[PDB]
């Protein structure tokens, strides 16, 4: 009917790697990571002795509360709140896209997501009511848990009326986020969607928890923990942070003169349905929801040049997806680049697919692929281009095409496919 | 004597100038938090809370429900007087 | 051709009114109710007194675990997970769609979400955690806690391959549970979305979070609590309980012989950015959101008969609804249909729109319309036919087109257009 093209204008990010665009891509170009060993006595009888923090501060690239949030809302908020807050604020900053008209308003909607909900804040008002009563409860508890609200926060502070949709589905949340976005824009329900995931679940009984289901990695070296693709890979290392994009129709975005940073192409989602908690082994999920992006987006396997993986430094996870991208792009597959970003970011959980996707859009714009690190050596079933330890200038004869990938509990698969122009 | 209403008064009043959501300046005995304070109803509910702990008495939601103003609240604080 | 039609073939409900297709409608438009006093010792604290749980037993309309899960399970999954694999295990019945090809399960997503965590959980975890230490954390911990781990299991147990959503929009979320499947059946991506929604977080803590927050009905009348459009309303009534609704593309399920409720023509999203708290007055986003539907729907605000209100015996909230309806529909405002069914079924949050959604369904396929109930009296601005008390035919020899509406925490609106063929 009508095809309307999808683009990316805005990036905000909050990382273990610090605060803002070029920074944090720099970093991470860099070879920084943000893991780092966990302290307090709080942690101690924990297996899990790391963890990846958002640096906090005045200093640059650091996240300042205060400079996105007011002091009587750092009282009311959660921590994941404020962090989508900070990201949205920059994103939109940096798409310059701020509407004015209700036409714009309506015309803009928000899709940001949290993965899942900050134990601690649950924890602290059950006491709270156990020990002191009713009388004493906040009122604040309830939208403290809920996912919305910073989709909420973030839709009244920059009049977005359009399009609402605040989704968690724990780690693909922010694969979720992009791709509903992008459906939304190119069937017409919105000229401009602000699309992410945030979390900031690092906690003595999260960690607790996710030790206990065998997730996490026990290396007490923060240096080494998240290994993606490497043999001692033990488990996956939990993050925090949010990333928030703005995408916004291709002619809306040229004419309104904006710096494009990259064309959303395609959206793909598949099941697993072998198991809960275990990866298909040949990856045939995978499989299947990178191909139905591809489809989306018009586009052949041999089109790829770049892979920003799920790969989260796990025994099971890190071998299917790599079975999976084998078997889709055939011989292909040793012309393309693959690079887990886990290393540097930890697992982002509900902003893990945000951020990959921004990753994602950065190396089309800049043509630089980010390193998988930690991959001092390869085991002969990974034999592909992980872009081990440093980054590589990302060169092909066609256009620059690549997927990000987001795999999650359940075996829900997520893949978006993002080209330069 | 237990009490004076001006005093219950000034007493309400300090811990709205408290409340950091409230202006100063605007915070007037007659004004509504909703209507004039611009505050919500999540809001109310601390400032009364924050009323229980200087007064030293619960106060039932359904009562707190109806104070929306200063002047309403030292009213129910001096019921317990004359 | 690239857009296709999207018709609803099966339901499954399990509800405070009961479990089952038949007996749940039949209730509904008979005026029954399961709203009830809570009966605890550890309720005396909080001022709510009233809720609606789904019936427990071996007797017909009553929710049996067993016959939908093993005992195992039922230690392993909370409650919300347990009603969804019902619900869904129902719905496919209902439906008669049981795929074995790999072409049939490929073509098979799932939708499912779950609006809360149900907050007991993490409380005892937690606690258990303090006193006891690291080793007594139960390994089932975190998954209980994440919100696709419904739709995990009934993906596996269905054999459901195609695109995963499972989406946590708190209330709205069985609402974007079916939108979402629509636009993804008929953008291609799926031939069969089974789309659904569950919450069970009735507990002390829930109850006192949300009663501080004043959204609870203080009513210590059962009865009487839950009145939408009444003027004594005073707060919304919680429920829990889950529903799924199969959706599918119009030739798949002619070609399987299959019976069709209804079609899904339209759905829309909006915002209002007025504020977090309050719904906007006037019902702009309400408007919006309705219109937007409509539009999806390429159907005049003339041609709707029926409207499935998301009135919550909210003052603010069902005022603004109204306002909204007025508006859009203007001088047909007065032709049409509105009710509530929350008076019957409780407000079950995440459930709310896929309930509300099969409800719109069986009222398109049958035409008959539930009531609002309580509805004993009416005030001026409240001047519609709400189908008080008791049902009422509406056999317009006319298309029949209702939208069911779903409003959220933060101004999230979303509208589902749903059609009789
Ligand atoms: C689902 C339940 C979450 C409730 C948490 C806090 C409201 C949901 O999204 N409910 C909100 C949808 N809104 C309505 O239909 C209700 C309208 N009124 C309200 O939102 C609340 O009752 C307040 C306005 C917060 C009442 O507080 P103040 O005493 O005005």
């Known amino acids: ?16 790697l610090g605060v803002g665009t070029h920074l944090v891509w720099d970093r991470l170009i860099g070879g920084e990571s943000g893991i780092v060993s966990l302290v307090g006595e709080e942690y101690k009888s924990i297996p899990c002795s790391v963890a990846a923090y958002v640096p906090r501060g005045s200093d640059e690239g650091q996240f300042n509360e205060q400079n996105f949030v007011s002091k009587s809302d750092i009282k009311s908020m959660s921590s994941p709140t404020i962090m989508a807050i900070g990201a949205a604020e920059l994103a939109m900053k940096d798409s310059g896209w701020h509407p004015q008209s209700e036409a714009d308003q309506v015309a803009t909607g928000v899709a940001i997501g949290m993965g899942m909900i900050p134990l601690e804040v649950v924890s602290e008002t059950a006491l709270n009511f156990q020990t002191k009563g009713y009388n004493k409860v906040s009122p604040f508890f309830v939208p403290k848990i809920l996912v919305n609200m910073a989709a909420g926060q973030v839709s009244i502070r920059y009049k977005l009326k359009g399009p609402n949709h605040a989704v968690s589905t724990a780690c ?52 080494l923990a998240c290994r993606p693709f490497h043999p001692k890979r033990d488990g996956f290392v939990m993050g925090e942070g949010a990333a928030v994009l703005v995408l916004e129709e291709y002619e809306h975005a040229v004419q309104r003169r904006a710096r494009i940073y990259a064309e959303v192409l395609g959206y793909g989602l598949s099941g697993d349905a072998g198991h809960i908690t275990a990866p298909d082994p040949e990856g045939e999920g995978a499989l299947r929801c990178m191909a139905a992006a591809l489809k989306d987006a018009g586009v052949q396997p041999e089109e790829i040049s770049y892979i920003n993986a799920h790969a989260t430094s796990t025994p099971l996870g890190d071998a299917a997806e790599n079975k999976a991208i084998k078997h889709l792009f055939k011989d292909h597959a040793y012309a393309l680049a693959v690079s887990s970003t886990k290393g540097a970011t930890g697992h982002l959980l509900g902003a893990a697919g945000a951020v990959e996707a921004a990753f994602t859009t950065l190396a089309c714009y800049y043509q630089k692929l980010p390193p998988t690190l930690n991959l001092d050596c390869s085991e002969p079933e990974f034999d592909l281009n992980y872009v081990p330890l440093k980054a590589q200038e990302w060169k092909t004869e066609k256009r620059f095409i690549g997927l990000t990938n987001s795999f999650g509990f359940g075996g829900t698969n997520a893949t978006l496919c993002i080209a330069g122009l | 004597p237990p009490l004076t209403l001006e005093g219950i008064q000034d007493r309400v009043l300090y811990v709205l100038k408290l409340y950091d959501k409230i202006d100063p300046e605007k915070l007037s005995v007659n004004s509504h938090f909703m209507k004039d304070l611009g505050l919500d109803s999540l809001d109310q509910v601390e400032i009364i809370m924050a009323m229980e702990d200087e007064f030293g008495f619960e106060i039932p939601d359904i009562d707190a429900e109806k104070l929306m103003c200063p002047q309403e609240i030292v009213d129910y604080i001096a019921d317990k007087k004359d």
């Open chain 1, 1 to 16: 009917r009508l095809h309307r093209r999808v683009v990316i204008t805005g990036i905000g990010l909050v990382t273990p």
């Open chain 1, 172 to 223: 693909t949340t922010g694969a979720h986020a992009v791709g509903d976005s992008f459906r939304f824009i190119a069937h017409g329900d919105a000229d401009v969607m602000v699309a992410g995931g945030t979390d900031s679940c690092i906690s003595p009984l999260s960690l607790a928890g996710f030790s206990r289901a065998r997730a996490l990695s026990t290396n007490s070296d923060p240096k």
